[PDB]
């Protein structure tokens, strides 16, 4: 395996688990709005659940930039404080 | 999940893949010699395969403590250079 895959695997299960998200539509490249059909309030929920997974309180300016699984994976995998 | 579980998952599959190792005997608590029936030279091979998994040079002095799956998970999950 790999650390990036470790992160991607947990992000995938977090996003799939969201009640509004069709888990069968989720890919490592899925964009929350354009692919998964979420609205702005939904994205806040998913990102917070991602923050829960890695115990990582993300500053608002960085957290608003996370709109897709690649965005989330790229930010978490480079953050040495992800748990 | 967790970083420790991410490590444990990769260590488990590395050890199971060892031809000398009966995968059905492998648990998160398995001791390489006493539980999996390996000898001292086998343990050297297993540690190297762990070094491969996390792209991590473990010094010989640190390798002396890695005799079991709990030992390996603890050492790797606390080494911030594990990949």
Under 8 Å between Cβ of A16 and A24: no
**Cα distance from B10 to chain A (closest Cα, Å)?**
6
Where in the sequence is the domain holding A23, given as residue range(s)? 1-83
Contact partners, residue A31, CB within 8 Å, separation at least 6 = A67, A68, A69
Under 8 Å between Cβ of B1 and A52: no
B83, A6: Cβ pair inside 8 Å? no
Closest among A40, A38, A39 to A16, alpha carbons compared:
A38
- Domain tally, chain A: 1
Q: How far apart are CA A44 and CA A63, in angstroms?
A: 9
Closest among B21, B15, B22 to B70, alpha carbons compared:
B15
**Cα distance from A56 to chain B (closest Cα, Å)?**
12
Counting one residue from chain A and one from chain B, the pairs whose CB atoms sit within 8 A come to 23
Give the three-state DSSP class for A31.
Answer: strand
**Cα distance from A63 to chain B (closest Cα, Å)?**
21
Give the experimental resolution in Å. Answer: 2.0
Q: How far apart are CA B56 and CA B13, in angstroms?
A: 17
How was this one solved?
X-ray
A9, B1: Cβ pair inside 8 Å? yes
Going B70 to B74 to B76 to B77, the CA torsion angle's sign is: positive
- DSSP alpha helices (H): ranges in chain B? 3-17, 40-53, 60-63, 69-77
Which residues of chain B are at the A interface, by a Cβ-Cβ cutoff of 8 Å?
Answer: 1-3, 6, 9-10, 13, 53, 80, 82-83
* φ, ψ for residue B68, nearest 5 deg: -155, 165
């Amino acid at each position: 395996g790999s650390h990036m895959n470790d992160v991607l695997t947990r992000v995938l299960e977090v996003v799939k688990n969201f009640e509004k998200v069709d888990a069968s539509k989720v890919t490592p490249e899925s964009h929350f709005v354009k692919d998964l059909g979420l609205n702005s309030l939904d994205v806040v929920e998913v990102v917070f659940a991602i923050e829960q997974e890695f115990i990582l309180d993300i500053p608002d300016h960085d957290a608003e930039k996370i709109q897709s699984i690649p965005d989330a994976v790229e930010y978490i995998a480079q953050n040495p404080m992800a748990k």
